[PDB]
Major capsid protein (Bacillus phage phi29), 487 residues
Amino acid sequence: GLLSVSGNEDNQLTVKATVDIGTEDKPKLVVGEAVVSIRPNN
Amino acid sequence: TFNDVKTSLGITESYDIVNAIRNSQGDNFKSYVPLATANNVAEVGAGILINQTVQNDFITSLVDRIGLVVIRQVSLNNPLKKFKKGQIPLGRTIEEIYTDITKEKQYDAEEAEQKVFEREMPNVKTLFHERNRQGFYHQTIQDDSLKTAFVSWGNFESFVSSIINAIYNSAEVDEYEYMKLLVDNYYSKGLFTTVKIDEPTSSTGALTEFVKKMRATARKLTLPQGSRDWNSMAVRTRSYMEDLHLIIDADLEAELDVDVLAKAFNMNRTDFLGNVTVIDGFASTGLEAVLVDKDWFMVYDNLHKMETVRNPRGLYWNYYYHVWQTLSVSRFANAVAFVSGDVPAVTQVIVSPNIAAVKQGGQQQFTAYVRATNAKDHKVVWSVEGGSTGTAITGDGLLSVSGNEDNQLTVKATVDIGTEDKPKLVVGEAVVSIRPNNASGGAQA
């Protein structure tokens, strides 16, 4: 989970994490998400 | 006499509201359908520029008269007139004087044996101001030509007063502009100390990192130990928090309220930290906010005199409002430029003895202060111009005036930025006078 912002970045990032509780063609991906905003570095 | 006037003079029509109503079905203009006389209201109801003699609706040969004359009256003021310091009636120069701190010498008892009477000079820097602005506001009232535009004395005597009040509005606007010119002058000279930022009103994250550079700099300015980093003469200048004014714009005010101060639980932790004024905006490219003391602005009036005269040959008056005032800026106050775009790497080179009067054959030490916007250290080139053969200067900044020198000198502390095709060199400068000695002559010396 170490998010690396590159620079030249202006888009509101949604950092997801899905957990496969399911199987092949029945994935049922349980996700919780974190909305990441961007502070520039001059 | 104008002979061809449409009601739509100057107008660019968007969609022809007359045709747009009667060609509506459910086009939201259906509420304007039961209006009986809407097409007359849609014709001239936005104001008419040029009058036209409209004949009367019942008897054609009569005309329709003007029944009411409204003389609109405005009062334009200066936000910045609280930065003024008053009036100076007599004399034309202001002398700022500032002693600066010393440099600690080490305790050395053996060196002190010969140096008790050493006479180390103090560090005083002077700055001279002068009456700059000297101009007048001319108006002319033709008191008898304007009696044809009026049929009432109460309106003619009110329209004469409005022309008078326009002279006083041209005062407080041009006073406001001449003080804003002092910011854009001082930045074009590179005398402001730049804090590089990112442009707000592009994101919230650009704004929140601007407020972090606001409250940090205003705390760095008013630290009790002072700093050299925020003046134009590079002197230790503590400021105080009540003396700090912020001259941002009208864009950062409402954006800070909405994006930041609305969602604040503790508004005093995200607000700007000094006094805040609001302007229309600095005309320099890249400048957004300016943090200065009130001691920065030095606006002293010199004259405020409305004079009249009447021409008898053509019946007009003339009114002259003479405004003379001193419009300059202290170089000892903390003056912070919050600059958004690209900046030069070094904006200024401050050589510390700006005024030297060393003797013929003597020595002057020079200390330069490079005003860099980046952690790149810059190497400083010393030179000396306007002199003779034996005048040389050390790369540490030590002048060695020749024994045969008579010319007024100038030293330079060059710092270059760009490469050899676009050399880009900023350079500081101090003026040195020689004042010839005695007890000399001959050869082998």
